[PDB]
Design an enzyme around this catalytic site. Structure first.
Site, PDB file in Angstrom:
ATOM      1  N   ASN A 140       0.622  -1.251  -0.055  1.00  0.00           N
ATOM      2  CA  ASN A 140       0.002   0.075   0.100  1.00  0.00           C
ATOM      3  C   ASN A 140       0.866   1.356  -0.009  1.00  0.00           C
ATOM      4  O   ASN A 140       2.060   1.231   0.617  1.00  0.00           O
ATOM      5  CB  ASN A 140      -0.977   0.006   1.202  1.00  0.00           C
ATOM      6  CG  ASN A 140      -2.258  -0.537   0.736  1.00  0.00           C
ATOM      7  OD1 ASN A 140      -2.923  -0.377  -0.520  1.00  0.00           O
ATOM      8  ND2 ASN A 140      -3.003  -1.247   1.600  1.00  0.00           N
ATOM      9  N   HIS A 192      -9.246   1.947  -3.154  1.00  0.00           N
ATOM     10  CA  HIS A 192      -9.945   2.538  -2.065  1.00  0.00           C
ATOM     11  C   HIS A 192     -10.863   3.817  -2.502  1.00  0.00           C
ATOM     12  O   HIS A 192     -11.033   4.841  -1.383  1.00  0.00           O
ATOM     13  CB  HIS A 192      -9.141   2.903  -0.970  1.00  0.00           C
ATOM     14  CG  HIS A 192      -8.290   1.793  -0.703  1.00  0.00           C
ATOM     15  ND1 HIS A 192      -6.956   1.533  -0.432  1.00  0.00           N
ATOM     16  CD2 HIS A 192      -8.799   0.643   0.095  1.00  0.00           C
ATOM     17  CE1 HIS A 192      -6.632   0.464   0.111  1.00  0.00           C
ATOM     18  NE2 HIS A 192      -7.781  -0.171   0.426  1.00  0.00           N
ATOM     19  N   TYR A 236     -14.351   3.051   2.285  1.00  0.00           N
ATOM     20  CA  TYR A 236     -13.368   3.995   2.326  1.00  0.00           C
ATOM     21  C   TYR A 236     -13.861   5.551   2.071  1.00  0.00           C
ATOM     22  O   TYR A 236     -13.447   6.466   2.545  1.00  0.00           O
ATOM     23  CB  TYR A 236     -12.222   3.785   1.663  1.00  0.00           C
ATOM     24  CG  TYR A 236     -11.154   2.738   2.214  1.00  0.00           C
ATOM     25  CD1 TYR A 236     -11.447   1.462   1.971  1.00  0.00           C
ATOM     26  CD2 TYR A 236     -10.109   2.834   3.083  1.00  0.00           C
ATOM     27  CE1 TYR A 236     -10.648   0.214   2.629  1.00  0.00           C
ATOM     28  CE2 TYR A 236      -9.531   2.063   3.834  1.00  0.00           C
ATOM     29  CZ  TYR A 236      -9.583   0.589   3.582  1.00  0.00           C
ATOM     30  OH  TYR A 236      -8.816   0.049   4.308  1.00  0.00           O
ATOM     31  N   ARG A 256      -5.303   2.234  14.867  1.00  0.00           N
ATOM     32  CA  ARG A 256      -5.577   0.836  14.393  1.00  0.00           C
ATOM     33  C   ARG A 256      -4.330  -0.078  14.285  1.00  0.00           C
ATOM     34  O   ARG A 256      -4.313  -1.030  14.460  1.00  0.00           O
ATOM     35  CB  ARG A 256      -6.141   0.765  12.896  1.00  0.00           C
ATOM     36  CG  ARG A 256      -6.419  -0.437  12.095  1.00  0.00           C
ATOM     37  CD  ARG A 256      -7.449  -1.142  12.887  1.00  0.00           C
ATOM     38  NE  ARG A 256      -7.802  -2.522  11.906  1.00  0.00           N
ATOM     39  CZ  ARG A 256      -8.017  -3.801  12.523  1.00  0.00           C
ATOM     40  NH1 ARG A 256      -7.924  -3.850  13.976  1.00  0.00           N
ATOM     41  NH2 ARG A 256      -8.130  -4.728  11.855  1.00  0.00           N
TER      42      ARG A 256
END
Lengths: 410, 403, 400, 408
Positions: A140, A192, A236, A256
């Site tokens: 990513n 996303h 997203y 997270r």
């Protein structure tokens, strides 16, 4: 026929390998070779892999990147530059400015990209000078890295993957008691940042039925939203359309990344003895990225011809959008090639996001290629979730100090 | 040769007429005819106009819109649908949601456009069935309306105008002791969303000198100009400095209320005046444009029109605010090359919003209006959209009905 | 599920029906209904068809066009406006001016098109007002007619077919001992004006091997070394005009030959229990794949939509498409060769000029169209040529 | 401020110089510097030039190309690669194959182009590494060379010029008793392959009147009623090929006539105080005014329209942005801006597209030095050989051009 896996120590590796096992019946796989900058992490994972594989193909470790990719037909990018500490910075830093802090969306994705580019440059270069393999990317931000490799490094065989397309399809398939390939979408957008306009199951238009169904299941879109926008929207997009709500959420709970650190540490302990893939993996993150990779490689290998939603140049998929935008769109995949399909026009609503973030994406690449602080500020200001002028300079300085080992901007 | 002026009671009319008198020496004007839905307001203004004109051409009032445009070669739209009360709603309503309230930008411009569309559809239709005149537009939001007329009503002779391009040019002109036409710009964007990339004075590239002088003037910091490298329309402050602008707008009297007081003052002055009071430059733009449409000289004006290759980076049909070559009734766009990625992110985003808004209006759809409202960079979050639109539509009851 | 066949009396009908019989095992067909302006011709052919069908689906005749297409999911256009006497005029008339006379290429195709437009306008309108069926088209000129329906009548579900793409694939298939679907092409151009750039068999690039095998009234070796394109045999009329003109003008007109062939086949169909000694396979296979949700590649005539990035999106081209559940999607191919493009652009402009002339019913615009064709008349011959075309086609087209 | 003139020995030079003198009152010119590969030819011309100029600016000769362009703001390409014998080959060779033999159109222009590219590559490269001057080009084939420099050598300041646009404008001007700038056109196409769709004089649409006037070896009335475009006269080679072939093939080759015109002009130049009437009346002698006016308007900040060879950039929305077209531009302070014109006529586009593909095919052949690709390019020209004639024709062309171009 050999597959290289870059970032062998990923806690996702076991699932990837299950996938490769599943397809090793319809296509020939001689060896899978792994590489990681963390030798010790990978040892544990690959030891587990060996127990699952049971000599059905050869499991190898390479000391260097070049050694892994040299004789590879497929190279999977599955590494996380800066690790979880980098993710933690990505999520944590923007928060103090009243900005969304998220792994791949907004300012968080900006710093992730700046961390990735140098590594992927080096990696893509080496691949290109040796095996000329097809690179399948999960690293990513996947779409943004694809845009970078496809349009700037100009390496054609680089296919960005994500877990959301396959997650959606499987959802529809269960709903309608059909196989994955029975599901055909009108799907477009950025990684996303994607939109579904039409759903087909076994040839039938079931879009209306899917919308009615989505209304029977506070953090998700209200009914009127679907009535008005008439698009199925990537989750997203909550960060864009529900920013106040998403900001209050992220800022009032544990970051997270810290929770995945604890999940990964638990999975690793399990991996020292596990004889079968644990549950803990399966219901988390994007556990099914594995199936996407393995299915894509399967279909790149055979001459069957199958549809995969993949990150690649538009090329007329959406006539509404420039040919050279890297989009996440369904393609005809067959014998080493990826062909784009006609879809018609994109919705103005979707295009507003697509155009905005695409400009931000290229602004960010430009800043990196010129190694320019000034251009990075320009890139930061252009993101729909970026800083106001009053915060931009301070924010960028915090980012660059946090990422000093991975990128240097003058 | 007749000019029609739609919205004769505008407090700006005297300046427009001054402009028309200045050009009436290079170009023939026989009559200027005025139309307004407020007859009494207009009587005051036009009485004043007659004293300024002194029979240099005929000043006429028409009781109907059609009467005004029927024999007109040029029609100037300068009316304000819903008046200042409408403007006050536009500025006031979004504030409660933590949203920028402004006459032409963001939610405020959304409601203004919804108010305008029905009227300009009717007006454009009438012009089209009668004189087929060139319409020069100031009614806000000017660019958005131009998008609407050019690409949906499909009336080609509709030119959107705005006061910023001329204001900048005059600024540069006096900085450099040159005439207006000695200034040539690389300029593109949407109305109130525009960017200047290159500045030329008498053929010389003076961009760098312009940047350096901008540093010696709630404005952008020095580093911003160093980094973005564009001269940016002041309305971009609402996008790029939203927190700052929201704080400002929401802690002061709404601007419309200030204008109300200024206009009431000007109108009392107009009953008595024999010359224009000191107490705006859109006038020059309109008159100079009409002048240059009339002659075969060929002159550059920044106007709102279809791209058509002005910015190669952008679709042909986007209505942009760009420099054009103007000559004998025709407007040609000029090559400019590529637009900056930073500029384009704004241009694309709100262009999508612009068309979503038009589509909502054409189908008279509340659902589609929510879609449009969600798409604006300065629009509501999903949690506030439905309430905000219901408030806009109640306030604008008399002007638009959405189903 | 009903298929309508317009031009039932076509001597090709038997083969079409064999095709629909072959696919009637993978897909459900209730009834095939036929229509023809020549009732007597059709009766003989459809009586033959009934013997081949053997009640596997219902074979019906409609008295009217509307009656045929009213309940149809698919409508096949396979009529010949003006018949073979029309094709005879097409081939014969241009010869007098030193111009190529050919059924679908050059001035011949121009008159054929003007003959077709009125009829397809009428037929497309009636389909659109009733069943909204997918129309699969053989009627020549196929591609030009498709350009007309897609971009001027604006009827989306109209798919132009031709027999050359399938002829080529079949050839490659048996050269390499592979099935038809094992063959994948980079293929583009207009109908009868197409080029192959790349050939794949079972995923392998065999373009080189195809070129080497092609060298073992046709193009010389050096031509393939230079142009590096496998070229449609119709390109002979553009690239070898002198040689083609010499050939056409010193032999019996082709239509005359076909008349004799058809009269022969018709006498045979009266009693024939079996088909006597390839467009059919294309039609049936396309309908098959439109019906299932499998997803298969067919070269068909349709809007470019990014197949060739080098060409406008709305040019109707003959290109490979992904076909599935009633939908036809174009595939990425990349850039077209400059050489191919010069032919594609020139004749596309011709095609639209011709349609514009028809829609305005203008003699003046028809001259313009005629002059624009690479195989058209010189200024000195244009006016006489047009006046000869309009005279011969009096009953089919009136230009003002 | 210095102007370099490449090909000083051209018999057009005097006219060019007259043009530069006419504009030297509105713009400053310090020196005009001349260069030619034929020193002797140039000496006679430039000697004549000096008598015309009368010390209004300095007239200089450079021994080298580099020496001429080094300090120049403008460089004029005015040379003829292979000279008149080259032109003679171009006109003569295609004739035996039943092909149109012409200086700039069809197969003749192909060989002219292959002769040109090597030289312009060298010259553009040198200009680029020194002065970065604007190059104004007359060298034929002008449009094709412009395509080459703009899109392959990627030198932006290269403007192709031709004499037909200005000849047309002047015709209209006299017909309507107006100045040249009072005439505004909808004009587009390729060099020697251009079309006029609309004619404006002093703002009035006079297209109808121009068509009526044109009807009072040339196109018949019905042609203008049908096509509804004013067509460049070179289109006769495409549209009236049979008639043009019969004409060219039964008369002395044109090149041979200009050889005798030029020899006569050179004799005149030795003692002439004023420009001769035979020079005023020949070739495309008005190219001079086009060059001078272009340079004038690049110098001032006035802003003027000139029809010039440049990238489309949206001038014709029907055509790709990068096609080099001959089109009206806004010219001002060193910059050339393209104007909106809308759509191009389908008829015109069929020619434009076909020849443009041929142009790029030819360039690709040269850049790869490929005989194979040359054949491909030759076959693509609307006026090119049939397959049966291609191979023999190319080998004849390459033999004749041995000293200028080598293709493997």
């Amino acid at each position: 026929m050999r597959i290289a896996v870059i970032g062998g120590g990923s806690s996702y590796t076991p699932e990837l390998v299950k996938g490769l096992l599943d397809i090793s019946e319809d296509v020939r796989i001689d060896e899978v070779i792994f590489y990681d900058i963390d030798e010790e992490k990978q040892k544990i994972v690959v030891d587990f892999v060996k127990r699952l594989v049971k000599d059905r193909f050869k499991v190898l470790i390479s000391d260097t990147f070049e050694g892994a990719v040299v004789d590879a037909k497929y190279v999977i990018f599955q590494f996380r530059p800066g690790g979880l500490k980098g993710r933690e910075n990505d999520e944590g830093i923007p928060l103090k400015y009243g900005l969304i802090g998220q792994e791949t969306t907004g300012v968080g994705g900006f710093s992730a990209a700046l961390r990735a580019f140098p590594i992927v440059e080096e990696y893509v270069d080496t691949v290109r000078k040796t095996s000329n393999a097809t690179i399948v990317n999960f690293t990513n931000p996947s779409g943004h890295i694809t845009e970078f490799v496809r349009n700037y490094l100009e390496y054609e065989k680089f296919i960005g993957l994500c877990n959301v397309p396959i997650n959606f399809i499987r959802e529809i398939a269960e709903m309608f008691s059909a196989r994955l390939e029975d599901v055909f979408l009108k799907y477009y957008g950025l990684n996303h940042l994607s939109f579904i306009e039409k759903v087909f199951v076994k040839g039938e238009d079931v879009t209306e039925k899917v919308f009615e169904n989505l209304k029977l299941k506070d953090e998700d879109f209200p009914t009127w939203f679907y009535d008005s926008v008439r698009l199925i929207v990537n989750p997203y997009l909550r960060y864009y359309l529900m920013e106040k709500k998403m900001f209050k959420k992220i800022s009032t709970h544990e970051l997270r990344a810290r929770e995945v650190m604890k999940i990964e540490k638990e999975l690793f302990e399990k991996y020292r003895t596990a004889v079968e893939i644990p549950e803990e993996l399966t219901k988390r993150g994007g556990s099914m990225y594995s199936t996407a990779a393995a299915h894509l490689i399967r279909d790149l290998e055979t001459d069957e011809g199958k549809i995969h939603i993949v990150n690649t140049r538009n090329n007329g998929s959406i006539e509404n959008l420039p040919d050279d935008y890297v989009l996440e769109i369904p393609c005809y995949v067959r014998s080493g090639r990826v062909h784009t399909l006609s879809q018609g026009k994109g919705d103005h609503f979707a295009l507003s996001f697509i155009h905005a973030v695409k400009m931000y994406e290229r602004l960010t690449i430009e800043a990196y290629l010129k190694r320019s602080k000034k251009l990075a500020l320009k890139a930061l200001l252009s993101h729909p979730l970026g800083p106001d002028v009053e915060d931009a300079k301070d924010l960028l300085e915090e980012i660059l100090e946090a990422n000093r080992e991975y990128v240097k901007l003058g």
